[PDB]
């Protein structure tokens, strides 16, 4: 009965971790949109306080999934539960990677956009 409680804990945490990835995705897209207005431009940098928790949940799921798979060595059902958690966590990792890559590819294009043109009049010295 302890083990099933642990697996429920894993399930609930994986659900939040998915949620945070999706929130982060939105934070990306609106940071791409709005380049102009000063203070709100700074405001989307709260994405930091979305990234930190993603890392922490990653480290947690790391440790508890390792403990669970160790615990399930002698029971096939426990092992099945552990493997399901592994599969789902791997999928999450894949989602995170995809989001990161897409955002990197998009940040390059905006960078190319801005300076591939004649520029504001020359600096001071």
């Amino acid at each position: 009965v302890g083990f099933m409680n642990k697996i429920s804990q894993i399930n609930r945490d994986l659900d939040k971790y998915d949620h945070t990835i999706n929130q982060v995705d939105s934070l990306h897209k609106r940071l791409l949109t709005e380049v102009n207005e000063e203070q709100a431009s700074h405001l989307r940098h709260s994405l930091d306080n979305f990234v930190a928790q993603a890392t922490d949940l990653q480290f947690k799921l790391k440790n508890e999934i390792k403990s669970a798979q160790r615990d399930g060595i002698h029971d096939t059902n426990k092992q099945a539960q552990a493997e399901n958690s592994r599969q789902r966590f791997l999928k999450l990792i894949q989602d995170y990677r995809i989001v990161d890559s897409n955002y990197k590819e998009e940040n390059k294009e905006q960078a190319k956009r801005q300076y591939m043109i004649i520029q504001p009049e020359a600096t001071e010295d």
Partner: protein
């Protein structure tokens, strides 16, 4: 070799003796029959305060040379035209005179330059004239083979290319820090007046003392011993038996601060507020740090690791770095923060940083921490503006593997993740730790019991009020601690603490 007062330097004397004196010891009949000239220059290099002056001095006495003539680098310069170099010329006069007069039976002369790179940079101003003057004379049209010149420096990679040719500065030698055997021998040599004259107790075991002192430079051991003896005698004032016991040694050892050792004081200051585990994360973070420390110490191929910790502002990030450092026991520890660098000029900052990098490569084992990045880089978002050069210094630094088997761990912290990716610097770092701030009420409970804010009634009521009021509590620890103190030293905890705490989240 070791009959004379120099401990730990063994290979160096075999090499130097073999190359330098093996052609001045035999009768001139033989070596003349051999037809070989004499080495006429020497460059030994190393960190300061390692005993270079001493070795240079003792060499002359071994050969029964004339008394050494001494000069130091920057003093050569004068501010009139061509006298800055006249001084360089003056030094060889007596050797010339005695050579012309006597001939081949003259007695050897010795000259010592100090801080050679201070003037003699690569050529191509006064500087070219100085370098020229030394070249034309060190080996000129007229033969002069009864002289020897010794060179002392810290940076070999800046001297002009021509002085290092076979004929001017033949033998290049390196002086490194003493090993354990070096420290033991150093103690043995230094404590000779005490030993024979019988004013050291029999309880002190200098081998233990040697083991206890790591990265001590070899000069400061003298400081230790003289301080300990002075301590003992001052404690006495009786002439029964003036004995120096281990307590003096322990006291003096505790007092002194080596140059290449732990800088404890600033780290203790960094963590002045204490480390209380108000939640579960703290344990995990510290475990991570310990893990990485082990990985550095035990491996062979991973001679360097870069580790980043980041999180929201005020999350208390730097303290964790200091804590991880202090619970490790490595010999070399230093801290770079904006605090030191404030007020300096740009060139000064780059110099400071780069010095602070190079020193570490010497020691076997090192950890090095950086306090904040956007601050050092001079970021300000409107425009934006920042200094490119310092950025490049750091960028280059964070890839340099230690030149030899020495080992290094680099720790750094920031709050502006987003900027760093937009900078395209993020590739420096292998692994990351995150530090989010508190979003719970029980955590408030843990901290306030640890701070002992008030009696249980106030505590319970405030947690109840914030439970019923603030549902999505979210702030860092800084404001929590300062707000708690403000409420304590103010009146009526509900009147402020609750209100402030809502106003802050």
């Amino acid at each position: 070799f070791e009959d004379l007062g120099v401990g730990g330097l063994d290979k160096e004397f075999t090499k130097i003796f073999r190359r330098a004196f093996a052609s001045r010891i035999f009768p001139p009949s033989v070596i003349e029959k051999l037809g070989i000239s004499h080495v006429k220059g020497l460059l030994l290099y190393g960190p300061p305060g390692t005993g270079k002056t001493l070795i240079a001095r003792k060499i002359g006495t071994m050969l029964n040379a004339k008394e050494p003539k001494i000069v130091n680098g920057p003093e050569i310069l004068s501010k009139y035209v061509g006298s800055s170099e006249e001084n360089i010329r003056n030094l060889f006069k007596d050797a010339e005179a005695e050579y012309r007069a006597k001939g081949e039976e003259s007695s050897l002369h010795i000259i010592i330059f100090d801080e050679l790179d201070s003037v003699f940079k690569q050529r191509g101003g006064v500087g070219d004239n100085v370098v020229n003057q030394l070249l034309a004379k060190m080996d000129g049209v007229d033969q002069l083979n009864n002289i020897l010149v010794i060179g002392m420096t810290n940076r070999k990679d800046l001297i002009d290319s021509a002085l290092l040719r076979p004929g001017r500065f033949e033998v290049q030698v390196e002086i490194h820090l003493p090993d354990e055997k070096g420290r033991l021998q150093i103690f043995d040599i230094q404590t000779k007046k005490m030993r024979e004259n019988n004013m050291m107790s029999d309880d002190v075991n200098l081998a233990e003392l040697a083991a206890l002192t790591k990265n001590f430079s070899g000069a400061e051991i003298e400081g230790l011993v003289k301080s300990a003896s002075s301590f003992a005698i001052n404690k006495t004032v009786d002439i029964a038996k003036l004995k120096v016991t281990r307590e003096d040694f322990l006291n003096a050892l505790n007092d002194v601060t080596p140059a290449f050792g732990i800088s404890e004081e600033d780290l203790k200051t960094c963590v002045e507020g204490g480390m209380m585990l108000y939640s579960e994360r703290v344990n995990s973070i510290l475990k991570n740090g310990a893990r990485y420390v082990r990985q550095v110490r035990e491996s062979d191929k991973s001679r360097l690791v870069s580790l980043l910790i980041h999180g929201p502002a005020g999350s208390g990030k730097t303290a964790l770095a200091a804590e991880i450092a202090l619970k490790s026991g490595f010999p070399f520890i230093r801290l770079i923060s904006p605090n030191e660098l404030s007020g300096m000029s740009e060139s000064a900052k780059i110099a400071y940083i780069d010095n602070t990098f190079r020193d570490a490569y010497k020691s076997p084992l090192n950890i090095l921490v950086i306090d904040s990045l956007e601050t050092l880089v001079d970021w300000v978002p409107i425009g934006p503006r920042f200094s490119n050069n310092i950025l490049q210094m750091l960028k280059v630094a964070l890839k340099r593997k230690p030149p030899q088997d020495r080992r290094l761990l680099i720790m750094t912290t920031t709050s502006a993740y987003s900027v760093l990716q937009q900078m395209d610097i993020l590739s420096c770092f292998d692994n990351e730790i995150a530090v989010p701030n508190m979003t719970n009420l029980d955590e408030l409970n843990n901290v306030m019991i640890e701070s002992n804010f008030l009696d249980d009634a106030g505590r319970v009521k405030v947690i109840n009020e914030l439970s019923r009021s603030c549902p999505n509590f979210n702030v860092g620890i800084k404001k929590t601690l300062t707000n708690i103190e403000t409420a304590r030293h103010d009146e009526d905890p509900v009147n402020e603490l609750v209100e402030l705490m809502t106003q802050s989240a």
